[PDB]
Ligand binder design. Structure first.
Ligand SMILES: *[C@@H]1O[C@H](CO)[C@@H](O[C@@H]2O[C@H](CO)[C@@H](O)[C@H](O)[C@H]2NC(C)=O)[C@H](O)[C@H]1NC(C)=O
Ligand SMILES: *[C@@H]1O[C@H](CO[C@@H]2O[C@@H](C)[C@@H](O)[C@@H](O)[C@@H]2O)[C@@H](O)[C@H](O)[C@H]1NC(C)=O
Ligand SMILES: [Ca+2]
Ligand SMILES: [Cl-]
Ligand SMILES: [Zn+2]
Length: 601
């Protein structure tokens, strides 16, 4: 239960300490119980994950209503701006304002929407495929239009449809809750984490500068799809069917790199085989990564990291979650990683990314728990990726003894950037739109009667894609993407994509590097590390604009560092598109591809 504190700013400082102190114990339980589950999926452990979660709601309610009984009408016009937000957070009760039975209704909807997603199956005319790895693989590897069309249509129908009636009731209750906290809708509350009165306009001006890069990549890749699939399925002036980009959601188009290779005569960069020959196992891949940070004079992994982490899939027939993730137990003691690591090149990069999340934790663990977060929701993924921007370059792989010779031809530099663009450039329109759709549902502009209409309106407006089958309003294609039924903000991922290349430009300049930006490697740069150490140890204890300015010199998001990065492959794509007489964009916006002859037979 909460304590007894005064109703002024000087006593608020006391209400924080006791609150921050008790939050450790409660926060630690919620992370410890999820760990005992995600590394050992048993029903009994899943039931402990819920008890620890409900125990957190009780803590946030009790300490939130207390905060609201004391300082509610006098915390806004406060002295210390750090306290202005700490108590501002505590007073926000979200679902605790709802009546008791609805609070139950709110949670049950979260529980059912997540489960409905994980257990959605695509059964055949016979056995049934699942999202991971069955359907994911098909969408990446298969090159039969009719096949890809079956996985795409089957999954969206399976996952989307049953989620719509639940999502409506969730939106209705999510908004009732956060209005009692002073917000027009949940969206306004989400968007308030960035403290930017012109946030949505700043995001549109960002993408307006980025759109030329995607329209070029769009046409270039659309021509590649025209050769493989023909004219009956690829309109050179219309949208691209949404199942021919190697990804279920077209987020990234990296699994169709074998179709768009600028120069296939040059060898693909893949040091995976070399790693196996030198005897690298998972544990060594992390020791290598740990050394990347210590070269920057950053913190090494503490003993608890090695003791507790899960660096390999367990051998004792334990059901685990294999997706790589980094865990902060909010006790300044236990930091771990759970990853079914595999001795591959991509995994080596992933291990550095996930270790960035750790280095972040370690650097700000001396702050109050409320400030053990990134500067804004889009920082963690920006720190993990900016590191991977150095570790993925052949320059670095050569220095850690994984690439004997470093080629210098520009043709190979175009293949590297193109492979990058299929991840960093193709995702921008998607990371931008996902929350735009939710912002519309939360505000009301997108009532349940127009879930799929506004969904595909955005998908066609930004990604330049279209459904390969006809869709009406019984379908809820927005729910077929994990982050929707699981209620996970998405605009942060569009932000980190912009942020990282800002972090990269700065860290490379600080390291003294000169030359093509994509060939930069901050490895063994102690001046680059000190710059990171400033950002990482700040957490959220300062405005993210300040931190970014101290690090990058600019107090806002700027897409120019990203454009400068892809400067070479951008010009090369404009030349290819003009030699082909391409039409950037999709003027024939009403176009949809016909069904394959006698489908799905
Ligand atoms: C995975 O979770 C299960 C619980 O669902 C663990 O099984 C328990 O383990 C403790 C520790 O030895 C025993 O005292 C309990 O009797 C076990 N309960 C059941 C129902 O078997 C299991 O140990 C966990 N995995 C690992 C590797 O410890
Ligand atoms: C909505 O769609 C349902 C599924 O049928 C598929 O979509 C329609 C639009 C056609 O393209 C059809 O060839 C597809 O197989 C229909 O069963 C339903 O009647 C449609 N209309 C509604 C729900 O009002
Ligand atoms: Ca991801
Ligand atoms: Cl966010
Ligand atoms: Zn990450």
């Amino acid at each position: 239960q909460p304590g007894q504190f005064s109703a002024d700013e000087a006593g608020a400082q006391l209400f924080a300490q006791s609150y921050q102190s008790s939050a450790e114990q409660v926060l630690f339980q919620s992370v410890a119980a999820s760990w005992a589950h995600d590394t050992n999926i048993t029903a009994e452990n899943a039931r402990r994950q819920e008890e620890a979660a409900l125990l957190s709601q009780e803590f946030a309610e009790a300490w939130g209503q207390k905060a609201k009984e004391l300082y509610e009408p006098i915390w806004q016009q406060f002295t210390d701006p750090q306290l202005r937000r700490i108590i501002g957070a505590v007073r926000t009760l979200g679902s605790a304002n709802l009546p008791l039975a609805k609070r139950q209704q709110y949670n049950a909807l979260l529980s059912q929407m997540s489960r409905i997603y994980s257990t959605a199956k695509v059964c055949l005319p016979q056995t049934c495929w699942s999202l991971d790895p069955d359907l994911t693989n098909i969408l990446a590897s298969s090159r039969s239009y009719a096949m890809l069309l079956f996985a795409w249509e089957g999954w969206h129908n399976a996952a989307g449809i049953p989620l719509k009636p639940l999502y409506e009731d969730f939106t209705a209750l999510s908004n009732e809750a956060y209005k009692q906290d002073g917000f027009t809708d949940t969206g306004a509350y989400w968007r308030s984490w960035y403290n930017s009165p012109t946030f949505e306009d700043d995001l549109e001006h960002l993408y307006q500068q980025l759109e030329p890069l995607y329209l070029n990549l769009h046409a270039f890749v659309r021509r590649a799809l025209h050769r493989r699939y023909g004219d009956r399925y690829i309109n050179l002036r219309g949208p691209i069917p949404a199942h021919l980009l190697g990804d279920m959601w077209a987020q990234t188009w990296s699994n169709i790199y074998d179709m768009v290779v600028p120069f296939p005569d040059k060898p693909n960069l893949d040091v995976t085989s070399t790693m196996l020959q030198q005897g690298w196992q998972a544990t060594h891949m992390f020791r290598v990564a740990e050394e990347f940070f210590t070269s920057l004079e950053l913190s090494p992994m503490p003993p608890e990291f090695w003791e507790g982490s899960m660096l390999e899939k367990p051998a004792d027939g334990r059901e685990v979650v294999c997706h790589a993730s980094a865990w902060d137990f909010y006790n300044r003691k236990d930091f771990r990683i759970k990853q079914c690591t595999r001795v591959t090149m991509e995994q080596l990069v992933v291990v550095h990314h996930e270790m960035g999340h750790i280095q972040y934790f370690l650097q700000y663990k001396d702050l109050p728990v409320s400030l053990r977060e990134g500067a804004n929701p889009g920082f963690h993924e920006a720190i993990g990726d900016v590191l991977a921007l150095s570790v993925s370059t052949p320059e670095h792989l050569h220095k850690i003894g994984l690439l004997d010779r470093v080629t210098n031809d520009t043709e190979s530099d175009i293949n590297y950037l193109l492979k990058m663009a299929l991840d960093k450039i193709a995702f921008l329109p998607f990371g931008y739109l996902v929350d735009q759709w939710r912002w519309g549902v939360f505000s009301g502009r997108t009532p349940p009667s127009r879930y799929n209409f506004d969904w595909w309106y955005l998908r066609t407006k930004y990604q330049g894609i279209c459904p390969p089958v006809t869709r009406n309003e019984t379908h809820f294609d927005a729910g077929a993407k994990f982050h929707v039924p699981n209620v996970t903000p998405y605009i942060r991922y569009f932000v980190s994509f912009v942020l990282q290349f800002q972090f990269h430009e700065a860290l490379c300049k600080e390291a003294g590097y000169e030359g093509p930006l994509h060939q930069c490697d901050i490895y063994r740069s102690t001046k680059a590390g000190a710059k990171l150490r400033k950002v990482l140890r700040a957490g959220s204890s300062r405005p993210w604009q300040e931190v970014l300015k101290d690090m990058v010199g600019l107090d806002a998001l700027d897409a120019q560092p990203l454009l400068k990065y892809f400067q070479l492959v951008t010009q090369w794509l404009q030349e290819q598109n003009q030699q082909n007489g391409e039409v950037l964009g999709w003027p024939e916006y009403q176009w949809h591809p016909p069904l394959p002859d006698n489908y799905p037979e």
